[PDB]
Design an enzyme around this catalytic site. Sequence first.
Site, PDB file in Angstrom:
ATOM      1  N   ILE A  17     -68.256 -27.636  78.492  1.00 15.69           N
ATOM      2  CA  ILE A  17     -67.518 -26.387  78.593  1.00 15.69           C
ATOM      3  C   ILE A  17     -67.221 -26.013  80.045  1.00 15.69           C
ATOM      4  CG2 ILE A  17     -67.643 -23.883  78.330  1.00 15.69           C
ATOM      5  CD1 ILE A  17     -66.936 -25.529  75.805  1.00 15.69           C
ATOM      6  N   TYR A 161     -83.641 -21.222  72.283  1.00  7.49           N
ATOM      7  CA  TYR A 161     -82.177 -21.175  72.278  1.00  7.49           C
ATOM      8  C   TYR A 161     -81.653 -19.788  71.870  1.00  7.49           C
ATOM      9  CZ  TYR A 161     -77.297 -22.011  71.046  1.00  7.49           C
ATOM     10  OH  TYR A 161     -75.921 -21.877  70.912  1.00  7.49           O
ATOM     11  N   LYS A 165     -79.784 -16.781  73.937  1.00 10.40           N
ATOM     12  CA  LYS A 165     -78.437 -16.314  73.565  1.00 10.40           C
ATOM     13  C   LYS A 165     -78.398 -14.805  73.336  1.00 10.40           C
ATOM     14  CE  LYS A 165     -76.077 -20.164  73.910  1.00 10.40           C
ATOM     15  NZ  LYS A 165     -76.808 -20.610  75.112  1.00 10.40           N
ATOM     16  N   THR A 196     -71.710 -31.092  68.810  1.00 11.52           N
ATOM     17  CA  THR A 196     -71.516 -30.870  67.378  1.00 11.52           C
ATOM     18  C   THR A 196     -72.740 -31.302  66.569  1.00 11.52           C
ATOM     19  OG1 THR A 196     -70.378 -33.001  66.988  1.00 11.52           O
ATOM     20  CG2 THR A 196     -68.992 -31.098  67.607  1.00 11.52           C
TER      21      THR A 196
END
Lengths: 238, 238
Positions: A17, A161, A165, A196
């Site tokens: 990204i 994780y 977030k 993915t």
Amino acid sequence: APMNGQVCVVTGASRGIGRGIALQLCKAGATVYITGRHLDTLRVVAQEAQSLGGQCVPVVCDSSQESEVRSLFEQVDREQQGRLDVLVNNAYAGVQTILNTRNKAFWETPASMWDDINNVGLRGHYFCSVYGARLMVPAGQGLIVVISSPGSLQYMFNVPYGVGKAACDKLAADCAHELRRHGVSCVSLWPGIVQTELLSSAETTELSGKCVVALATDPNILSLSGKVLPSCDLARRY
Amino acid sequence: APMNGQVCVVTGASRGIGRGIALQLCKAGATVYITGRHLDTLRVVAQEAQSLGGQCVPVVCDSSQESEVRSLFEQVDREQQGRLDVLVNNAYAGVQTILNTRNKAFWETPASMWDDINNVGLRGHYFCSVYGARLMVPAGQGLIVVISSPGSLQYMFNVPYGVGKAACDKLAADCAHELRRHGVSCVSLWPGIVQTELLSSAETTELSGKCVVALATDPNILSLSGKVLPSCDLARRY
């Protein structure tokens, strides 16, 4: 070129990204500082970025080290006479660890796994935001982008994780709150997951970049400040 | 005594909310391990706690240091033959910094302010939860309490505080998620703010303790797992 004269910093720009965003920002004509731990890798991205347009400046910065982040923004200040338009707080640090420990519970994995995910990928984002905001606030404008995901809302993949977030979405909101009166915007971008296996990526990283260019050139950007922005919706908006 | 035979760990127990909880847990008859950076201070709390009942074991632990947290839970394992019923993740680390920097924006305060608030007060909570869960999961029961506040929902006081609180509420939820199948509960307790300057405290810290004893002795505790629990509501429940 839409972002001619503009100055950007993109963290975690060596791949994924962050690399996609750096490339689109240079294509839009910006000067883009790109960071990572390894100069050689960054130089390859910079060659590609600068080929699309603008300028691209590799800076080695381990954002877990506050003195390195200070050094990064000192360079930007020095080279650009204090100008900073866009900061993209992005991190791929820890994603491979998430993958490797799939289906192991938080007590099964090492306690130190927190630092693989939420050092550069949370703590570093705070450090960058502090030093970047210092440059933006005097100018009365600028945009800080925090890369996040629906893991802010619910359990996703593993504990650190999801906690990270949640923290990133809050970081965007709370920074936005303080920055608004100074005309500086801060948003949380959910660009979708590149890895993915966690859940095209190529297409996705390019889309993320186009979104950041769109956000950075939107005269009404302050109206989105403090919000969560799914990249697919921004495509429709722009 | 309601918590006879039970084993608890309370972090940040030298003062405030943590001290109040340690005291009520000992009063209920538990063995309570209390942690902090300074043994002398902890011993004074322990003298008072043990006077109410149970047993109180001061352990020096800087929870920003993973090896110290490991050492803490090794001691518990050794001394109690692997038994751990309750872990209260509580931290006052950084609250004084919040106070001192009132009305200074996140870019005005040092970048390192993150570590004053979200090292022991977030990262340390993760470390403790890992090592504690390792003891609970084999027993098919136990309770982890994360101390948080409405700062998880909205801007409160300053950026790192609010981000940390968002992270703490998520930590409780996501740990709960993984622990549920093993019969172990994890909740987020909002005991109200002891440091009123931020916004009786004496009464409040005692109430928080009574709530934790109530939670720890509730046969239906798993039904509350993963939830946010305002202490005033628990008073009504119990």
